[PDB]
């Protein structure tokens, strides 16, 4: 289940893998726009902090949820900043969300007293007052109930059909996490003398699997000389012995 657009659930993608390679393979998303850089390039780069917003909107309504876009769904349901580096993922959900006799579970805020700020939701359902006279949270002339029930049908057109949309926002922060996905990292070469950079440490040596049972958690190895003894890959838990190239 996905939360309604008027009160979208927010889940922070922090301390969690960033993998869009599966998303490209699935190819089940009606719209998968990406911003700032090519899709492979963002997939490889590690993201320190990402933000995920989950909501259900019509296919036509998804346009309102776009950077610098003004619409009924963009002015009171939710708003995206004009400069956005995040990738927006939208997929048709007509098969599951829509039901016979129409689907009225989801709700959208057609109007609101003031334009909603970006990355904000309205937790108040109080009646908006277009008229000077105050409705005060009850129905009145010159004002309307802000939330309008959604109407989803399989017979309805693809724009009318419901879409589950998750918005990803990319941010940079000092706070780090333990693992990563592609890692913008060149493939490791073994059985040949090579210069290898691992966790900010550069060493030149032939790379082979470690005969010694070095423990998996440590990423580095310690020697009496203080030269690195072993290294562990940042993409996979493999222990590699370090041997300097023959001299």
């Amino acid at each position: 289940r996905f939360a309604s657009v008027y009160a979208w659930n927010r889940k922070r993608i922090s301390n969690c893998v960033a993998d869009y390679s599966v998303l490209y393979n699935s190819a089940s998303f009606s719209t998968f726009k990406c911003y700032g850089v090519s899709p492979t390039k963002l997939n490889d780069l590690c993201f320190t902090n990402v933000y995920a917003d989950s909501f259900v909107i019509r296919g036509d309504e998804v346009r309102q949820i776009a950077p610098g876009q003004t619409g009924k769904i963009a002015d009171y349901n939710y708003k995206l900043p004009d400069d956005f580096t995040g990738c927006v993922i939208a997929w048709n959900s007509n098969n599951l969300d829509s039901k016979v006799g129409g689907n009225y579970n989801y709700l959208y805020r057609l109007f609101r007293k003031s334009n909603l700020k970006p990355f904000e939701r309205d937790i108040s359902t109080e009646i908006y007052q277009a008229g000077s006279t105050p409705c005060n949270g009850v129905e009145g002339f010159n004002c309307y109930f802000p939330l309008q029930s959604y109407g989803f049908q399989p017979t309805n057109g693809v724009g009318y059909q419901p879409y589950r949309v998750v918005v990803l926002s990319f941010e940079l922060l000092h706070a780090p996490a333990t693992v990563c996905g592609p890692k913008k990292s060149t493939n490791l070469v073994k059985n040949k003398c090579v210069n290898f950079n691992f966790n900010g440490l550069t060493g030149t040596g032939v790379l082979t699997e470690s005969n010694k049972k070095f423990l998996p958690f440590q990423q580095f190895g310690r020697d009496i000389a203080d030269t690195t003894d072993a290294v562990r890959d940042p993409q996979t838990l493999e222990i590699l012995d370090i041997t300097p190239c023959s001299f």
Partner: antibody, heavy 118, light 108 residues
Framework: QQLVESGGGVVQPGRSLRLSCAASGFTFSSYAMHWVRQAPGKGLEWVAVISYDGSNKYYADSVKGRFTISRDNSKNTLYLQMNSLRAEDTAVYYC????????????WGQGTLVTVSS | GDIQLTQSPSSLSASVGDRVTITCRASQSISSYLNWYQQKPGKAPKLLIYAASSLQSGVPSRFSGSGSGTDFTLTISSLQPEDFATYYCQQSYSTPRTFGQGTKVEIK
């Protein structure tokens, strides 16, 4: 989806009787809710509103008896205490909702009889 | 003061396949805040038209909403034995809300 009501009964005049009505399927919380009256053979007469999305209570001045209305939002339930009774209020009550050009949420309870008689 | 409603006629004994125009005039003009309810004894009221311009979902096309401002009306077509029922109009313009006195469409 569904509305249930507290039990009706025969109450002496001048007394008080709290009216409970719980929701199901979708919450009370995001909406308003109403009470209406139907005497036998008489038309449907609106009684009082509740407005949870701020807080405000409006009563009919036709039957202005301080029939107080508040809510148990976390139980999706609503409470209107029958105060300052008089016998012509002997009728059935309904929990109500009005489609105010935006929604289609008009959902009605099963109806219980309040009786005002000695 | 209050807003008076005027539902006319307050009953109409009818026959099969009619086209009954149950009128619910309002003393104070209402721009679009009017609703129609179909009710039977021992049964909860069912909304037929919302805003008097758009039919409620789950309501047959034969029931229709007509009129605007001071005068509002309900159009019923292809009348059937199941269709015959008591019909109440409805303001939502101001507070207090009042409902019409009802119109019982019944078999002749």
């Amino acid at each position: 989806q569904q509305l249930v009501e507290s039990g009706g009964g025969v109450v002496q005049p001048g007394r008080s009787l709290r009216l409970s009505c719980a929701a199901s399927g979708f919450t009370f919380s995001s909406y308003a809710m109403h009470w209406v009256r139907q005497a036998p053979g008489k038309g449907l007469e609106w009684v009082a509103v509740i407005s949870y999305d701020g807080s405000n209570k409006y009563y009919a001045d036709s039957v202005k008896g301080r029939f107080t209305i508040s809510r148990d939002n976390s139980k999706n339930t609503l409470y209107l205490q029958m105060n300052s009774l008089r016998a012509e209020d002997t009728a059935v009550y309904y929990c109500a909702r009005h489609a105010t050009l935006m929604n289609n949420k008009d959902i009605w309870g099963q109806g219980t009889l309040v009786t005002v008689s000695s | 003061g209050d807003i008076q409603l005027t539902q006319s006629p307050s009953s109409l004994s009818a026959s099969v396949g009619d086209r009954v125009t149950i009128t619910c005039r309002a003393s104070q003009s209402i721009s679009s805040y009017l609703n129609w309810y179909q009710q039977k004894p021992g049964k909860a009221p069912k909304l037929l038209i919302y805003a008097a311009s758009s039919l409620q979902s789950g309501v047959p096309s034969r029931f229709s909403g007509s009129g605007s401002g001071t005068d509002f009306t309900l159009t019923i077509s292809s009348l059937q034995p199941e269709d015959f029922a008591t019909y109440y109009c409805q303001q939502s313009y101001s507070t207090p809300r009042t409902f019409g006195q009802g119109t019982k469409v019944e078999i002749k």
